Amino acid sequence: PMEEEEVETFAFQAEIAQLMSLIINTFYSNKEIFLRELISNSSDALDKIRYETLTDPSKLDSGKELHINLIPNKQDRTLTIVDTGIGMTKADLINNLGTIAKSGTKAFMEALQAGADISMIGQFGVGFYSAYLVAEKVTVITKHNDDEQYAWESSAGGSFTVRTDTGEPMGRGTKVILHLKEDQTEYLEERRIKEIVKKHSQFIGYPITLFVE
Numbered sequence: 001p002m003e004e005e006e007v008e009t010f011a012f013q014a015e016i017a018q019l020m021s022l023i024i025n026t027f028y029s030n031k032e033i034f035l036r037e038l039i040s041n042s043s044d045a046l047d048k049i050r051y052e053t054l055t056d057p058s059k060l061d062s063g064k065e066l067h068i069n070l071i072p073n074k075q076d077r078t079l080t081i082v083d084t085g086i087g088m089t090k091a092d093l094i095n096n097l098g099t100i101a102k103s104g105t106k107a108f109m110e111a112l113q114a115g116a117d118i119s120m121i122g123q124f125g126v127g128f129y130s131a132y133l134v135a136e137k138v139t140v141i142t143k144h145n146d147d148e149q150y151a152w153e154s155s156a157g158g159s160f161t162v163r164t165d166t167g168e169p170m171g172r173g174t175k176v177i178l179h180l181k182e183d184q185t186e187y188l189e190e191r192r193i194k195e196i197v198k199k200h201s202q203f204i205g206y207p208i209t210l211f212v213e
Contacts, residue, residue: 007163010094015101015109016129017158022112023132024156031184033119034134035193036200037127038081038176039208042068045085045174046206052086059086062145062172067207070197072188074213077180079135079187084173089147090162093140098152098160100125132156134187135178141165142174 012020046066052059063084071080088097108121118130131138136155143149149169154160186192190212197208 003166005163005166007161009159009161010098011159012154012156013099013101015105016099016126017156018109019101019105019126019129020132020156020158022109023118023129024136026112028118028133030117030119031130031133032196033117033122033200034130035187035196037122037130039068039197039201039204041128042081042083042085042174042176043204043206045083045087049084049086049172059145059172067209068204069209069211070193071211072190072193072213074188077182077185077188079178079180080175081178082170082173082175084171087144087170087172087174088142089144090150091147092144093142093150093152093162097128097140098154100128131176131178134180134184136181137179139177139179140174141167141170141177143170143172145172 011017046068049059050066065084068081068083071082072078073080105124105126108116108124108126112118112121118133122130137153139151139153141149141151143165149165149167150162151165151167152160152162180187190210193210201208
């Protein structure tokens with residue numbers, strides 16, 4: 001009766017672990033930029049699948065619709081962003097997603113401590129980690145047609161877990177669930193969200209829809 005799943009635990013790279021440590025325990029005013037960065041990565045994934053479908057139309061068999069959906073849940077206190085982009089594989093996650101640190105991140109870390117904002121450091125391609133500005137734990141589900149559906153989740157602390165997702169199949173794309181901090185509950189109202197998206201992400205070449213309960 002009981003289904004026992006395989007799970008795998010990895011550690012964040014030293015500089016990323018330190019990054020998360022600063023990001024969470026440092027006060028930033030312009031944290032609203034997290035939405036811009038996340039939407040950018042989703043739209044990037046949309047670009048990728050878009051270019052894929054040029055040479056391979058069967059990439060759209062998993063879904064023809066290409067847009068981004070934001071689903072805030074007032075009871076869960078979570079902000080879920082789902083896209084129907086190209087998606088990413090297990091290798092992409094562990095090699096080029098939650099481990100994006102490089103020789104040079106050191107200066108960026110010190111910059112943040114010296115009074116830099118997240119907007120500037122995000123340019124280093126660490127904009128994905130901006131989720132911890134508003135959320136304390138983030139779960140990212142993704143599936144690429146050349147691989148299975150995977151479930152990533154981490155509460156920072158230097159470690160993260162990933163496994164094959166036995167949950168609801170997405171077909172293709174990415175699902176990011178931000179578990180927002182109590183002092184960041186304002187980002188569950190459409191009034192906050194639409195204000196930020198219109199301001200920072202109006203020039204997106206892909207449709208955006210907000211599901212408000």
